[model samples]
Target chain A: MQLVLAAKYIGAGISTIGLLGAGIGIAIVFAALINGVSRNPSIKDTVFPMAILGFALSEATGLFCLMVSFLLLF
Target chain B: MQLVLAAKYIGAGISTIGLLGAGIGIAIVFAALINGVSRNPSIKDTVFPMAILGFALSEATGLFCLMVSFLLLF
Candidate 1:
């Protein structure tokens, strides 16, 4: 019984590693965004749409992983 | 048998997190691609290959994580 639960926990724990990738990726992208905007706020007008696109793409990947996690859990 | 089953679920759940990383990595790279294009669409020719490379690398990692899940489950 404990082993079953342990397996569940271990699996879930390992999956959590995916979340780490997302957060780190977001950090890397946003960090660049911040840098770019700071250098030339004027470019924000042109840059923002692309930024959002990036965010969306990043978020998409995160959700993909999450879906896998759910599938595993069930 | 049950313990192994549970372990399978746990491992899968954990591996899903890898997508998060992949997503972020893709986003960061794609976003840069967008930026480059927006700046000079002409560079699209050169920039795309790099984006593909980034995507491939990021995806490989996700696959690795997912591989862990599969190995445990199977």
Candidate 2:
């Protein structure tokens, strides 16, 4: 029971760390995109689509972390 | 031992399915944004904001799954 107990807690703890990374990555990507758009308002049209593409690419990291966290528990 | 094994399987399975929804949602939004931006470069600014909004919303689904997994184990 003690070992199982320890495993459960450890799994949860490490998984939470993975979530933190994902959150931070999402924030950074959005912040950068916003700044870019603000600076080049004229190209907002040109930049908007690229920004979305960029955002998706950045989010892949978060997705990967999410998977890893689940794997750690099971 | 059986109980522990069952718990692990259930927790992992639920979270894994949750990730699938999030992944599909992200891909759809990303593809749409890319298509929209390519069509109207002038609307880049607007498209970017929408894309980020979509990305964030989709990510929440994954986050929820992660939380559920923790709750299941702990």
Candidate 3:
């Protein structure tokens, strides 16, 4: 039981690292969003959606990490 | 000394991600505002208020997340 619990703790801990990466990735995506908009302001409409698409996609990644951590702990 | 408690903490960290998403969402909204304004100054007046509305709404979402996470942790 102790071993199993240890595994759970370690697994959840690792999952946090993954979550951290997803956070960083979102930062990068948003950073690029600014550059994308500036490169061609005329396409503001276009770049905006793509950036938000990253928003939705990044949420999905965070969800998966949440699942991993919850399943491991529970 | 360790195990279930550590796992619980880790899980809570990830499960609270909804707030992070809300934060990123709000930040990106205004970031988009700056991006848009660079291209079209007129849109500043329009998008500025809209972004503020969105920031307010996202704050609402963050509050919701905070309450939910608290419930789950408790």
Candidate 4:
């Protein structure tokens, strides 16, 4: 029973750490967006698509982390 | 064995739902950027960086979902 308990805790711990990557990616993107928009008001239209693409790519990391979590649980 | 299989399915289903946020975020960003860029040609240079930044941020959602999926497997 103790062994099983330890295994469960370890699994959870590993999955939780996965969030770090997504967090950093998000922070970087937001910081850059704000800077870009402030300097050039007219570029919103042009920047939108590129931003979306970036967002999708970044989000993919989170998805991968989620998958790992599921693996651990099962 | 049945319990494990069931757990796996549940884990996958939960993680899959997370993808919706990412998809929407990406689509919105792209549509907005394309529209903005077309309207103002001069802002191209400025818009580029901003768009990239936004995309990265939005993509983070998808990444989160992926992470969840991975977790389910372990």
* Candidate achieving the largest TM-score: 1
Which candidate, 2 or 3, has the higher DockQ? 3
Arranged by DockQ with the best first, the candidates are 1, 3, 4, 2
Q: Which ranges in model 2 have alpha carbons more than 4 Å from their true place?
A: A1-74, B1-5
Q: Cα deviation in Å at residue A69, candidate 1? A: 3.0
Q: TM-score of candidate 3 restricted to chain B?
A: 0.66
lDDT of 1 by residue, A23-48 (tens): 77666667666766776566666556
Tens-place lDDT digits, model 1, residues B23-65: 7677679667655765555676787788778878877887787
Query: What ranking of all candidate models by lDDT puts the best one first?
Result: 1, 3, 2, 4
| Best model number under lDDT | 1
Quality of candidate 3 docking, DockQ: 0.16
Cα displacement (angstroms), candidate 1, residue B44, comes to 5.9
Candidate 2 lDDT tens digits, B1-74: 85585457445444534554455565556555555555455675777689779878986877687667656645
Q: For each candidate, how many residue pairs have backbone atoms clashing (under 3 Å)?
A: 13, 3, 0, 64
Candidate 4 chain B: worst 10 consecutive residues by lDDT?
Answer: B4-13
Best by DockQ: 1
Clashing pairs in 3: none
Error of 3 at A13 (Å): 2.0
Instruction: Specify the poorest-scoring 10-residue window by lDDT in model 1 chain B.
Output: B33-42
TM-score, cand. 4 vs. native: 0.52
